[PDB]
Design a protein around this nucleic acid. Structure first.
Ligand SMILES: [Zn+2]
Lengths: 133, 135, 54, 149, 214, 116, 100
RNA sequence: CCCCCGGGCUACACGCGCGCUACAAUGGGCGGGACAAUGGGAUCCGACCCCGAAAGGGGAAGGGAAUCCCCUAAACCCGCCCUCAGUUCGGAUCGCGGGCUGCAACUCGCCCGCGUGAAGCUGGAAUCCCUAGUACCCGCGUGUCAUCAUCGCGCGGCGAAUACGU
C-alpha cells in the first residue's frame, strides 16, 4: 500500500510518501545519510532513530520539499516523516514517545513573518532610524 | 641552494615568499600581471623565491621588456596606444613616473581643466567638495 | 513670429510629462498608465476605486 | 550507482581527472590571461581549472537540462566587492561556458535541442554513472549505510 | 581536512550530538539541580520557543544555552578586557552552524585533555562560576544605600554562561588563538579554580564587593 | 617633432575622418561616428572658408562640444564660457580634446573667514 | 468545439451573477460545462506621502485596488453560443470569449 | 508675461546631521556544492543560437500576465594558499585604454581592463534603536528612470539574550 502526507514550515511545503521497502529515505533525490550540513541532517534523522530498528528496516520513504531554506525544508521533512510513520504503524506508544520528545513533530509550528512599517522598511517593523536631538 | 634576497631588475625581493607576491614589489607589476608573466615564462607561481636561477631571472626580465611580442595580450598592459608611437607598450619603476609626469605636464601646457586641477591640488574626476576632501 | 512663442517637443526627460488635472511637472505617478501627480491622486483616488484595506 | 547517490564535489574531482584523457577537450589560447568573471579580482590559482569547469558544466547540463547559456552564467556568478559601495550579485561571462559546451559536443557528450537549452546524449549519460558507481563502491567502505542505495 | 567518517556522522543511539552520554553526569548543588536540563537528546536546538513563557529557561538544554550565549559579537556600549570588541560584519550572529561547530571542537579538546566527560566538566565550571551574592541600591527616607542581596538560581546560570563566553571572546581577540580553543581553556580553568578564568575572577570580585558592603 | 601616435600633422591633414577616428579615444570616435550636428557643420564651413581667404572676421561660437580636428590648427576660435567669448589659439597638442576644456566657467575660489 | 470565457471585475456580485446565469442556461440544456475556475487576484498597490510639503514626520498612504478573475469553458454547442451571447452583463465587468 | 541658445544649483581654508566601507582569523582569496519570496513587462521583458577577454553587439521563439520572461539570490558547506603582519587586511586617489543611453556627455553621467596603493590597529565626555519569527546579520524586486541607487516603501533566508517589574 501507499500513504501520502504533508508538512509545513515558513514558506516551505514537503510532500512525503511511504510504503513497504528496505529502509531507504530520499529527500529530493539524494539520500539522507549524505545531507549537508549536520545540523540539518540530525533534524531529519531524529524520528527515524526514535522509532527504532524493526520499524524502519521495513519501510521505504520518499520526500519532495519546495521553498524556504535548508532549515525550513529539514523541519518540514521531519514533520511529514513522523506523521507518516504514525499513520502507517498505528502506535500510541510511538505517538506518546514523539510528543514527550518534542510535540512539534506532530503539531507543526504556526509562525510566519510580520509585515514592516514605514521608518526603516527594509530592516523591519520595529527598527527605526536613529534620532539626533 | 637557497637565497634570501633575489635581485630582479633594479629591485630586490623576499625569497621567503612565493614568486607571484615577491614580484609584486616592482612598481608597475601586480599579482595578475605577475601571474601572466610567470605563465608565459614556464614557472610555478607557488614555489618559494630564491629557488630562482639566473636562467629564470633573465627570462622574466626579457619578458618584461617586450611583452606583446611574447604574446602578452595588448589589453592586459599598462600603456596601450602611447601618444607618439601607437605601440601598445609596458612601463615599470623609473620609466613609469616620468610618463605620469609628462602626461600631466602636457595637460598643463595646453591650459586644460584637468591640468589646472592637478596644479591647484584638487579633485579631477567630478567629485563634490563641500563636506569631504578635508586636507 | 508664431514660431518664437511655443515649445521644442520633448520625447524624454522631465518636461516630457505633465499632470492631467493641474499641470505640474516633477512628481508624477506613472504606475499602470496613470498620469496624475502625487497630490491629485490622493484626492481623486476614492473615486477611481481605491481603498485603505491595510 | 547513479549520479543522484553521491556528493557533487567528489564526483566533479573524479570526473575532471578523467576529462583529460579525452583529447577533444583542451584549453584555448587565452586561458592563462583571463579572469573567471566580472565578479572576481584575481586569477584562478590552479593550472588545471579548465577541466573542473567543464566537468561542472557537464554535470549541470545533466541535472538541469535542457539548459542554455544564461542559467549557467547565473549559477557561476556571485557578489562583487565594489569598494565603498555595497555588495551586489553579478553574472559571469559567456565565452568560457560556450567553448566548454562546444567542446563537449565535439566529444559527443551533449546535443542541442532546437530552441530549448542543451542536453546529454546516452554516452554522456554513461560516463557519469560509471564514475559514480566507482566512487560509491569506494565510499561504502567508510559510510557503511550507503549500501542500500 | 576531516575524514569522511566524521564529515558524515550517523548516530546510532540517543546521546547528546550522538556521541556523549548525559546520565552519568551529576550535580551536588541543590539550588541549581532543577534548572540544569540534562534530558537525553541528540540535537540541542529549540527554535525560539520557551522564551516568551517566564520560566521557559528551565526546559532548554544547557548545551543550547551555551550555544546561544556563544552566538556573540563581542561587547557593545560596555567594555571587557579593556577594549570595545565591535565587529559588525565578521561576527557569528544568527549562525548556529558556526556556534555548533565551535562548541563541538571545544568538547573534543576537553575530552582529549581531561579524560572525562565535557558535560560534567561544564557543570562543575558553571557551579564554580555561579555567584551567590551581589549588590543593589535600596531607599528609605529618600536616600540611596548599597546593600548585599542573595541571587537566584536562574540568574546564577545566566551570569556564569555569559562570563564563560566573554572569556572565550576575549582570549581570541586579535591573537593567533582560536575561539574554540579559548573556550576550552576557559572551561578547564573555571573547573579547576585557576585565576586565568575571567569567570572565577568576576565571581570572586562580586562576592568581595558584596561582603564589603555587608 | 610632434607626433600623434606615430604620424605627423602633414599626414593627419590628408587622412580622412574614418581613418583619423581610429586614432582617437572611444568617446570622440563615437561622436564622429554618430555625426556632426547643424551648428558644428556651420562652424566647420566657417573655418574652411576662413583658412583660405574669404572670412577675414573672427570665429565665434557657443559650441563647447566640438572636437578639435587637425584642419582647425593655426586659427583662434572664440568659445563661450557663459558670460564672454574666450579666445583659444589651437595648437597641435589640442587635437582630440573638446573645445570647452580650454574655456572655463567658474572662477577660482580664494576664501575668507567664517561667521556664524 | 469548445469556448472559453474570461471574466474580470472589481465586484464579486456581478461575477457571481454571470456565473449563475451561464451555469443555469447550460444546465437547463444538455451541455457539459467547466468551472467556475478562480484565478489569483490582481492587486494594484500605491504608497504615497500625505503631506503636500516637506515639514513633518513621514506618514504614508497605502491605496489598493483588488481585481477578481474567473474562467469558464462551455463546449460551444449548437444553440449554447447564441443563447449565451444574449446575456445582460453589467458595465463594471470585463467579459471575453475565445473559441478553441 | 511667453520661447529658444549657452552657463549655475556639482563652486570649497572649516563646523554639524544621517549613513556606507573598514580597520582581521567570530577572517581574505581561488575552485567546487546548495536552497527563496514579494512584485513588474509594448517599440516592453527578451529565452535559444552566434560573435567579443570583459563591458557590451548582431539574429530571434514566446508573452497583452497561474501559460513566456525578468530569476539556479546572498549569508551558508567542502578542499587548498595566507598564520597576527599596515599584511594575500583596507581600498580612497590618479594615469593609459575600451564601450553604452542620449539632439548634445569638457564644465557634469554610469560600466570594464591593467597599473598606483591614502588615512585606519576597537574609538574620551556623552548618546540611539529594540520584548519573538522580534533585534543583530544576508542579499532581492519596486518608486523615481532615455541612462544613473551608499535613499524611500516592501520581500523573504538564518535566527537569539533578558524581564514578566518599577
Ligand atoms: Zn495635479
Amino acid at each position: 500500500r501507499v500513504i501520502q502526507t504533508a508538512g509545513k514550515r515558513k514558506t516551505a511545503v514537503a510532500r512525503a510518501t511511504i510504503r513497504e521497502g528496505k529502509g531507504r529515505v530520499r529527500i529530493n533525490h539524494k539520500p539522507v545519510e549524505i545531507i549537508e550540513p549536520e545540523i540539518a541532517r540530525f533534524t531529519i534523522m531524529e524520528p527515524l532513530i526514535l522509532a527504532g530498528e524493526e520499524i524502519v528496516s521495513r519501510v521505504d520513504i520518499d520526500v519532495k520539499v519546495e521553498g524556504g531554506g535548508f532549515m525550513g525544508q529539514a523541519e518540514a521533512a521531519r514533520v511529514a516523516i513522523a506523521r507518516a510513520l504514525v499513520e502507517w504503524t498505528n502506535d500510541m506508544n510511538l505517538k506518546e514517545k514523539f510528543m514527550k520528545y518534542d510535540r512539534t513533530m506532530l503539531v507543526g509550528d504556526s509562525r510566519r513573518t510580520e509585515p514592516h512599517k514605514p521608518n526603516r522598511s527594509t530592516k523591519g517593523p520595529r527598527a527605526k532610524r536613529q534620532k539626533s536631538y | 641552494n637557497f637565497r634570501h634576497i633575489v635581485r630582479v631588475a633594479g629591485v630586490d625581493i623576499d625569497g621567503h615568499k612565493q614568486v607571484r607576491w615577491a614580484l609584486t614589489g616592482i612598481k608597475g607589476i601586480g599579482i595578475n600581471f605577475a601571474t601572466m608573466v610567470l605563465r608565459v615564462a614556464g614557472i610555478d607561481p607557488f614555489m618559494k623565491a630564491g629557488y630562482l636561477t639566473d636562467e629564470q631571472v633573465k627570462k622574466i626580465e626579457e619578458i618584461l621588456a617586450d611583452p606583446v611580442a611574447h604574446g602578452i595580450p595588448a589589453w592586459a598592459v599598462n600603456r596601450p596606444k602611447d601618444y607618439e608611437t601607437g605601440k601598445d607598450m609596458h612601463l615599470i619603476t623609473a620609466k613609469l613616473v616620468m610618463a605620469w609626469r609628462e602626461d600631466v605636464n602636457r595637460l598643463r601646457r595646453i591650459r586644460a581643466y584637468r591640468g589646472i586641477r592637478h596644479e591647484l591640488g584638487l579633485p579631477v574626476r567630478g567629485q563634490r567638495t563641500r563636506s569631504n576632501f578635508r586636507h | 513670429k508664431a514660431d518664437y512663442n511655443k515649445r521644442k517637443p520633448r520625447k524624454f526627460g522631465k518636461g516630457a510629462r505633465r499632470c492631467m488635472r493641474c499641470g505640474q511637472y516633477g512628481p508624477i505617478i506613472r504606475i499602470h498608465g496613470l498620469m496624475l501627480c502625487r497630490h491629485c491622486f490622493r484626492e481623486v483616488a476614492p473615486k477611481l476605486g481605491f481603498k485603505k484595506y491595510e | 550507482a547513479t549520479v543522484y547517490d553521491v556528493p557533487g564535489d567528489l564526483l566533479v574531482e573524479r570526473v575532471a581527472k578523467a576529462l583529460k584523457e579525452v583529447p577533444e577537450i583542451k584549453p584555448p589560447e587565452w586561458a592563462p590571461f583571463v579572469k573567471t568573471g566580472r565578479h572576481k579580482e584575481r586569477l584562478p590559482e590552479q593550472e588545471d581549472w579548465w577541466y573542473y569547469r567543464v566537468a561542472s558544466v557537464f554535470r549541470k547540463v545533466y541535472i538541469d537540462g535542457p539548459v542554455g547559456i544564461e542559467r549557467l552564467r547565473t549559477w557561476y556568478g556571485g557578489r562583487k566587492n565594489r569598494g565603498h559601495a555595497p555588495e551586489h550579485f553579478y553574472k559571469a561571462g559567456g565565452s568560457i561556458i560556450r567553448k566548454a559546451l562546444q567542446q563537449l559536443e565535439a566529444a559527443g557528450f551533449v546535443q542541442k535541442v532546437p530552441g530549448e537549452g542543451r542536453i546529454v546524449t546516452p554516452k554522456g549519460q554513461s560516463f557519469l554513472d560509471k564514475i559514480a558507481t566507482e566512487l560509491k563502491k569506494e565510499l561504502e567502505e567508510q559510510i557503511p549505510e550507503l549500501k542500500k542505495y | 581536512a576531516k575524514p569522511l567518517t566524521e564529515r558524515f556522522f550517523i548516530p546510532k543511539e540517543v546521546k547528546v550530538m550522538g556521541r556523549w552520554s548525559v546520565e552519568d553526569v551529576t550535580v551536588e548543588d541543590p539550588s541549581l539541580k532543577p534548572y540544569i536540563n540534562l534530558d537525553a537528546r541528540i540535537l540541542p536546538h529549540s527554535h525560539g520557543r520557551y522564551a516568551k513563557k517566564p520560566f521557559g529557561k528551565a526546559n532548554v538544554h544547557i548545551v543550547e544555552r551555551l550555544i546561544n550565549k556563544v552566538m556573540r559579537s563581542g561587547a557593545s556600549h560596555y567594555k571587557a578586557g579593556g577594549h570595545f570588541m565591535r565587529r559588525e560584519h565578521r561576527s557569528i550572529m544568527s549562525k548556529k552552524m558556526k556556534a555548533y561547530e565551535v562548541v563541538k571542537e571545544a568538547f573534543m579538546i576537553i575530552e582529549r585533555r581531561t579524560k572525562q566527560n565535557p558535560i560534567q566538566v561544564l557543570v562543575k565550571a558553571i557551579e564554580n562560576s555561579a555567584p551567590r551574592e551581589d549588590t543593589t541600591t535600596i531607599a528609605f527616607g529618600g536616600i540611596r544605600y548599597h546593600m548585599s542581596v542573595d541571587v537566584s538560581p536562574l540568574r546564577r546560570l545566566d551570569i556564569a554562561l555569559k562570563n564563560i563566553a566573554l572569556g572565550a571572546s576575549i582570549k581570541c581577540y586579535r591573537n593567533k588563538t582560536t575561539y574554540a580553543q579559548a573556550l576550552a581553556e576557559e572551561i578547564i580553568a573555571a573547573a579547576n579554580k585557576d585565576p586565568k578564568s575571567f569567570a572565577y575572577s568576576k565571581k570572586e570580585e562580586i562576592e568581595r564587593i558584596a561582603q564589603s558592603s555587608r | 617633432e610632434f607626433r600623434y601616435r606615430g604620424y605627423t600633422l602633414d599626414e593627419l591633414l590628408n587622412m580622412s575622418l574614418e581613418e583619423f577616428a581610429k586614432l582617437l579615444p572611444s568617446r570622440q570616435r563615437r561622436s564622429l561616428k554618430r555625426g556632426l550636428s547643424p551648428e558644428q557643420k556651420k562652424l566647420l564651413r566657417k573655418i574652411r572658408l576662413a583658412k583660405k581667404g574669404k572670412y577675414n572676421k573672427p570665429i565665434r561660437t557657443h559650441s563647447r562640444d566640438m572636437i578639435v580636428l587637425p584642419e582647425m590648427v593655426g586659427m583662434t576660435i572664440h568659445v563661450y564660457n557663459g558670460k564672454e567669448f574666450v579666445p583659444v589659439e589651437i595648437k597641435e597638442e589640442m587635437i582630440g580634446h573638446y573645445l570647452g576644456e580650454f574655456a572655463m566657467t567658474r572662477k577660482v575660489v580664494q576664501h575668507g573667514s567664517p561667521g556664524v | 468545439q469548445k469556448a472559453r470565457i474570461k471574466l474580470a471585475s472589481t465586484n464579486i456580485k456581478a461575477l457571481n451573477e454571470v456565473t449563475d446565469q451561464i451555469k443555469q442556461i447550460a444546465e437547463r440544456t444538455g451541455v457539459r460545462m467547466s468551472g467556475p475556475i478562480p484565478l489569483p487576484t490582481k492587486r494594484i498597490r500605491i504608497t504615497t506621502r500625505k503631506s503636500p510639503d516637506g515639514e513633518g514626520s513621514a506618514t504614508f498612504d497605502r491605496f489598493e485596488l483588488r481585481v477578481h478573475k474567473r474562467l469558464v469553458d462551455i463546449e460551444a454547442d449548437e444553440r449554447a453560443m447564441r443563447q449565451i451571447m444574449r446575456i445582460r452583463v453589467p458595465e463594471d465587468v470585463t467579459i471575453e470569449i475565445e473559441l478553441i
